[PDB]
């Protein structure tokens, strides 16, 4: 079973950038397809970005797309999500999330582990 930690959430104006991190354990790092949702407040989680094992393949949704980058790093057991041009509406709980994949380039949308989450708020 694999444990997730989100980091780099905070407070920033609109405008701004942020970078999240997830480290995930580490013996099983590379089995894991692995993805960032959001939920914001007063709505349902929302899928964000997706990766897959070999780092190679992304995915993600149409409300971040040329914002955000996700990214991995198969040496340091982590993934990454940098997060441009911030908007309001950006605000919320951002949760990394794993699932197996059978293959190393597949991304996923459904995913059995997820984190704790990191808090983001995007001011004017």
């Known amino acids: 079973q694999v444990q997730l930690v989100e980091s780099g959430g905070g407070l920033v104006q609109a405008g701004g950038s942020l970078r999240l991190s997830c480290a995930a354990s580490?013996?099983?790092?590379?089995?894991?397809?692995m993805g960032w949702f959001r939920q914001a407040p007063g709505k349902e989680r929302e899928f964000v970005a997706a990766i897959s094992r070999s780092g190679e393949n992304t995915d993600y949704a149409d409300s971040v797309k040329g914002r955000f980058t996700i990214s991995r790093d198969n040496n340091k057991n982590t993934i990454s999500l940098q997060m441009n041009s911030l908007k309001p509406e950006d605000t919320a709980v951002y949760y990394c999330?794993?699932?197996?994949?059978?293959?190393?380039?597949?991304?996923?949308?459904?995913?059995?582990?997820w984190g704790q989450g990191t808090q983001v708020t995007v001011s004017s």
């Open positions: 580490e013996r099983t790092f590379t089995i894991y397809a």
């Open positions: 999330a794993a699932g197996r994949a059978i293959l190393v380039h597949t991304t996923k949308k459904e995913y059995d582990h």
